[PDB]
Protein backbone atom coordinates (compact mmCIF):
# COMPACT_ATOMS: atom_id res chain seq x y z
CA UNK A 1 0.00 0.00 0.00
CA UNK A 2 1.67 3.14 1.51
CA UNK A 3 2.05 4.13 5.18
CA UNK A 4 2.68 6.93 7.63
CA UNK A 5 3.50 7.21 11.36
CA UNK A 6 2.30 10.57 12.64
CA UNK A 7 1.88 12.58 15.77
CA UNK A 8 -0.22 15.63 16.57
CA UNK A 9 0.64 17.75 19.67
CA UNK A 10 -1.44 20.58 21.15
CA UNK A 11 -0.67 22.73 24.10
CA UNK A 12 -3.20 25.14 25.34
CA UNK A 13 -2.47 27.84 27.87
CA UNK A 14 -4.78 28.15 30.85
CA UNK A 15 -4.44 31.68 32.40
CA UNK A 16 -6.45 31.33 35.63
CA UNK A 17 -5.87 27.57 36.25
CA UNK A 18 -2.07 27.40 35.91
CA UNK A 19 -0.09 24.85 33.86
CA UNK A 20 -1.21 24.52 30.16
CA UNK A 21 -3.05 21.57 28.84
CA UNK A 22 -0.95 19.40 26.72
CA UNK A 23 -2.33 16.65 24.44
CA UNK A 24 -0.53 14.36 22.21
CA UNK A 25 -2.15 11.66 19.85
CA UNK A 26 -0.20 9.33 17.56
CA UNK A 27 -1.33 7.58 14.41
CA UNK A 28 -0.36 4.73 12.04
CA UNK A 29 -2.37 6.14 9.12
CA UNK A 30 -5.96 6.81 10.11
CA UNK A 31 -5.64 4.69 13.29
CA UNK A 32 -4.84 6.22 16.60
CA UNK A 33 -2.77 3.95 18.65
CA UNK A 34 -1.42 6.04 21.58
CA UNK A 35 -2.22 9.30 23.23
CA UNK A 36 -0.83 11.41 26.09
CA UNK A 37 -3.01 13.78 27.97
CA UNK A 38 -1.41 15.74 30.77
CA UNK A 39 -4.97 16.25 31.88
CA UNK A 40 -6.17 12.74 31.88
CA UNK A 41 -6.61 10.92 35.16
CA UNK A 42 -3.32 9.27 34.10
CA UNK A 43 -0.67 11.80 32.86
CA UNK A 44 1.02 8.91 31.08
CA UNK A 45 1.30 7.73 27.48
CA UNK A 46 -1.38 5.10 27.01
CA UNK A 47 -2.21 2.70 24.24
CA UNK A 48 -5.32 3.53 22.21
CA UNK A 49 -5.36 0.55 20.10
CA UNK A 50 -5.46 -3.01 21.41
CA UNK A 51 -2.62 -4.32 19.37
CA UNK A 52 -0.60 -1.83 21.38
CA UNK A 53 -1.42 -3.59 24.70
CA UNK A 54 1.35 -6.04 23.98
CA UNK A 55 3.94 -3.44 24.80
CA UNK A 56 6.28 -3.52 27.78
CA UNK A 57 6.82 -0.92 30.57
CA UNK A 58 10.12 0.22 29.06
CA UNK A 59 8.14 1.65 26.13
CA UNK A 60 5.32 3.30 28.05
CA UNK A 61 7.77 4.78 30.57
CA UNK A 62 10.05 6.16 27.89
CA UNK A 63 7.19 7.55 25.83
CA UNK A 64 5.71 9.03 28.92
CA UNK A 65 8.91 10.94 29.64
CA UNK A 66 8.98 12.05 25.97
CA UNK A 67 5.56 13.47 26.23
CA UNK A 68 6.23 15.07 29.58
CA UNK A 69 9.41 16.70 28.28
CA UNK A 70 7.64 18.13 25.23
CA UNK A 71 4.89 19.38 27.36
CA UNK A 72 7.61 21.15 29.37
CA UNK A 73 9.45 22.63 26.35
CA UNK A 74 5.99 23.54 24.91
CA UNK A 75 5.25 25.48 28.09
CA UNK A 76 8.51 27.35 27.82
CA UNK A 77 7.67 27.79 24.10
CA UNK A 78 4.28 29.24 24.93
CA UNK A 79 5.90 31.85 27.18
CA UNK A 80 8.50 32.81 24.59
CA UNK A 81 5.76 33.34 22.02
CA UNK A 82 3.68 35.29 24.39
CA UNK A 83 6.77 37.48 24.44
CA UNK A 84 7.45 37.77 20.73
CA UNK A 85 3.87 38.94 20.32
CA UNK A 86 3.96 41.15 23.40
CA UNK A 87 1.00 39.32 24.79
CA UNK A 88 -0.95 39.49 28.00
CA UNK A 89 -0.53 36.39 30.17
CA UNK A 90 -4.20 36.52 30.87
CA UNK A 91 -5.30 35.17 27.51
CA UNK A 92 -5.20 31.61 26.24
CA UNK A 93 -2.94 30.43 23.35
CA UNK A 94 -2.33 27.29 21.42
CA UNK A 95 0.82 25.85 20.25
CA UNK A 96 0.39 22.91 17.88
CA UNK A 97 2.96 20.65 16.36
CA UNK A 98 2.51 17.94 13.76
CA UNK A 99 5.15 15.62 12.45
CA UNK A 100 5.14 12.42 10.48
CA UNK A 101 7.12 10.16 8.15
CA UNK A 102 5.93 8.18 5.16
CA UNK A 103 6.94 4.99 3.40
CA UNK A 104 6.98 4.37 -0.35
CA UNK A 105 4.52 1.76 -1.76
CA UNK A 106 7.91 0.04 -1.94
CA UNK A 107 8.34 -0.02 1.88
CA UNK A 108 11.09 2.53 2.71
CA UNK A 109 11.38 6.22 3.59
CA UNK A 110 9.49 8.46 1.20
CA UNK A 111 8.89 11.93 2.65
CA UNK A 112 8.89 13.27 6.22
CA UNK A 113 7.48 16.57 7.56
CA UNK A 114 7.19 18.83 10.48
CA UNK A 115 5.31 22.01 11.42
CA UNK A 116 4.38 24.32 14.14
CA UNK A 117 1.42 26.59 14.41
CA UNK A 118 0.52 29.14 17.00
CA UNK A 119 -3.03 30.64 17.65
CA UNK A 120 -4.24 28.77 14.72
CA UNK A 121 -1.72 29.77 12.16
CA UNK A 122 1.35 28.50 10.49
CA UNK A 123 4.48 29.56 12.35
CA UNK A 124 7.48 27.52 11.47
CA UNK A 125 7.91 24.85 8.93
CA UNK A 126 10.70 22.36 8.46
CA UNK A 127 11.49 22.49 4.74
CA UNK A 128 11.35 19.68 2.21
CA UNK A 129 15.10 18.99 2.20
CA UNK A 130 14.62 18.61 5.94
CA UNK A 131 17.67 20.76 6.58
CA UNK A 132 16.03 24.13 6.90
CA UNK A 133 13.13 26.15 8.26
CA UNK A 134 10.74 28.66 6.86
CA UNK A 135 9.41 31.21 9.33
CA UNK A 136 6.07 32.87 8.69
CA UNK A 137 6.28 35.87 10.98
CA UNK A 138 9.13 37.96 11.99
CA UNK A 139 8.73 36.40 15.44
CA UNK A 140 9.05 33.28 13.58
CA UNK A 141 12.31 34.51 12.12
CA UNK A 142 13.78 34.70 15.60
CA UNK A 143 12.53 31.16 16.15
CA UNK A 144 14.05 30.41 12.77
CA UNK A 145 17.59 31.57 13.52
CA UNK A 146 17.50 30.20 16.99
CA UNK A 147 16.59 27.06 15.35
CA UNK A 148 19.30 26.85 12.81
CA UNK A 149 22.08 27.99 15.11
CA UNK A 150 20.92 25.13 17.39
CA UNK A 151 20.88 22.66 14.59
CA UNK A 152 17.31 21.34 15.25
CA UNK A 153 16.67 20.23 11.67
CA UNK A 154 19.61 17.79 11.96
CA UNK A 155 17.96 15.94 14.92
CA UNK A 156 14.59 16.17 13.34
CA UNK A 157 15.93 14.70 10.20
CA UNK A 158 17.37 11.69 11.87
CA UNK A 159 14.20 10.92 13.74
CA UNK A 160 12.18 11.53 10.72
CA UNK A 161 14.38 9.42 8.49
CA UNK A 162 15.11 6.36 10.64
CA UNK A 163 13.48 6.15 13.96
CA UNK A 164 10.17 7.13 12.61
CA UNK A 165 10.24 4.72 9.68
CA UNK A 166 11.84 1.96 11.73
CA UNK A 167 9.02 1.98 14.25
CA UNK A 168 6.32 2.47 11.69
CA UNK A 169 7.57 -0.90 10.57
CA UNK A 170 7.27 -2.44 13.98
CA UNK A 171 3.72 -0.99 14.43
CA UNK A 172 2.57 -2.33 11.09
CA UNK A 173 3.78 -5.74 12.25
CA UNK A 174 2.05 -5.54 15.62
CA UNK A 175 -1.09 -4.27 13.85
CA UNK A 176 -1.01 -6.80 11.00
CA UNK A 177 -4.68 -7.74 11.41
CA UNK A 178 -6.42 -4.44 11.99
CA UNK A 179 -4.12 -2.30 9.89
CA UNK A 180 -3.86 -4.24 6.79
CA UNK A 181 -7.47 -5.09 6.74
CA UNK A 182 -9.77 -3.12 4.51
CA UNK A 183 -13.57 -2.87 5.08
CA UNK A 184 -15.67 -1.98 2.04
CA UNK A 185 -18.75 0.19 2.10
CA UNK A 186 -22.26 -1.20 2.55
CA UNK A 187 -24.01 1.02 -0.06
CA UNK A 188 -27.47 2.31 -1.00
CA UNK A 189 -29.59 4.90 -2.64
CA UNK A 190 -32.51 6.80 -1.06
CA UNK A 191 -35.27 8.90 -2.44
CA UNK A 192 -36.60 11.97 -0.68
CA UNK A 193 -38.81 14.08 -2.95
CA UNK A 194 -38.91 17.83 -2.68
CA UNK A 195 -41.55 19.31 -4.95
CA UNK A 196 -44.37 17.85 -7.05
CA UNK A 197 -41.84 17.47 -9.86
CA UNK A 198 -38.46 16.58 -8.19
CA UNK A 199 -36.67 14.72 -5.46
CA UNK A 200 -33.30 14.21 -3.83
CA UNK A 201 -31.39 11.03 -4.43
CA UNK A 202 -28.84 10.27 -1.66
CA UNK A 203 -26.07 7.75 -2.37
CA UNK A 204 -24.86 6.21 1.00
CA UNK A 205 -21.54 4.56 1.93
CA UNK A 206 -21.54 3.11 5.44
CA UNK A 207 -19.11 1.15 7.59
CA UNK A 208 -16.02 1.46 5.37
CA UNK A 209 -12.28 1.52 6.34
CA UNK A 210 -9.85 3.18 5.73
CA UNK A 211 -11.62 6.55 5.20
CA UNK A 212 -10.53 7.48 1.70
CA UNK A 213 -13.63 6.95 -0.44
CA UNK A 214 -15.12 8.47 -3.62
CA UNK A 215 -18.81 9.00 -4.48
CA UNK A 216 -20.07 10.26 -7.80
CA UNK A 217 -23.51 10.81 -9.19
CA UNK A 218 -23.42 10.69 -12.95
CA UNK A 219 -26.43 10.51 -15.22
CA UNK A 220 -26.69 7.61 -17.83
CA UNK A 221 -23.26 7.61 -19.56
CA UNK A 222 -21.69 11.14 -19.84
CA UNK A 223 -21.21 11.19 -16.12
CA UNK A 224 -21.12 15.01 -16.15
CA UNK A 225 -21.97 15.81 -12.73
CA UNK A 226 -24.51 18.21 -11.68
CA UNK A 227 -24.13 19.92 -8.35
CA UNK A 228 -23.83 17.00 -5.90
CA UNK A 229 -23.69 17.76 -2.15
CA UNK A 230 -21.05 15.67 -0.46
CA UNK A 231 -20.98 15.72 3.34
CA UNK A 232 -17.52 15.52 4.87
CA UNK A 233 -16.55 11.89 5.38
CA UNK A 234 -17.38 10.99 9.03
CA UNK A 235 -16.68 8.54 11.74
CA UNK A 236 -19.38 6.00 12.73
CA UNK A 237 -17.72 5.56 16.06
CA UNK A 238 -16.71 1.98 15.62
CA UNK A 239 -13.57 2.37 13.59
CA UNK A 240 -15.39 2.77 10.32
CA UNK A 241 -16.61 5.84 8.40
CA UNK A 242 -19.72 7.02 6.59
CA UNK A 243 -20.22 9.33 3.64
CA UNK A 244 -22.94 10.33 1.23
CA UNK A 245 -23.59 12.26 -1.87
CA UNK A 246 -26.85 13.86 -2.88
CA UNK A 247 -28.25 15.18 -6.05
CA UNK A 248 -31.56 16.64 -7.16
CA UNK A 249 -33.52 14.94 -9.84
CA UNK A 250 -36.97 15.56 -11.66
CA UNK A 251 -39.36 12.76 -10.66
CA UNK A 252 -39.56 10.03 -13.27
CA UNK A 253 -35.81 10.46 -14.19
CA UNK A 254 -34.39 8.56 -11.17
CA UNK A 255 -32.81 5.87 -13.52
CA UNK A 256 -31.04 8.36 -15.69
CA UNK A 257 -28.85 8.52 -12.54
CA UNK A 258 -26.14 6.27 -11.27
CA UNK A 259 -23.78 6.53 -8.29
CA UNK A 260 -20.25 5.20 -8.44
CA UNK A 261 -18.54 4.27 -5.30
CA UNK A 262 -14.69 3.84 -5.08
CA UNK A 263 -12.87 2.24 -2.16
CA UNK A 264 -9.87 0.05 -1.54
CA UNK A 265 -11.96 -2.69 0.06
CA UNK A 266 -13.86 -3.20 -3.17
CA UNK A 267 -12.50 -5.68 -5.70
CA UNK A 268 -13.99 -3.15 -8.06
CA UNK A 269 -16.03 0.03 -8.27
CA UNK A 270 -19.72 -0.33 -7.42
CA UNK A 271 -22.66 1.30 -9.22
CA UNK A 272 -25.97 2.00 -7.64
CA UNK A 273 -29.26 3.00 -9.00
CA UNK A 274 -32.36 3.87 -7.20
Amino acid sequence: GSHSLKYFHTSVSRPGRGEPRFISVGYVDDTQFVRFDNDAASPRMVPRAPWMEQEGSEYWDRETRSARDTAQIFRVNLRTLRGYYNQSEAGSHTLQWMHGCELGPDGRFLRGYEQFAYDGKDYLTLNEDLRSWTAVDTAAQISEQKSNDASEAEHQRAYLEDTCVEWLHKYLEKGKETLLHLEPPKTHVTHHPISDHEATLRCWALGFYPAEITLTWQQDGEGHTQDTELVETRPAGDGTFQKWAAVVVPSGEEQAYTCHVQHEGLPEPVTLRW
Binding site: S66, L124, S147, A150, Y159, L160
Partner: peptide, 9 residues
Amino acid sequence: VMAPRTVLL
Protein backbone atom coordinates in the same frame (compact mmCIF):
# COMPACT_ATOMS: atom_id res chain seq x y z
CA VAL B 1 7.66 6.66 18.98
CA MET B 2 7.28 10.36 19.26
CA ALA B 3 10.43 12.36 18.43
CA PRO B 4 13.11 12.36 21.17
CA ARG B 5 13.31 16.13 21.44
CA THR B 6 11.24 19.08 20.28
CA VAL B 7 12.21 22.50 19.01
CA LEU B 8 12.82 25.30 21.48
CA LEU B 9 11.24 28.34 19.87
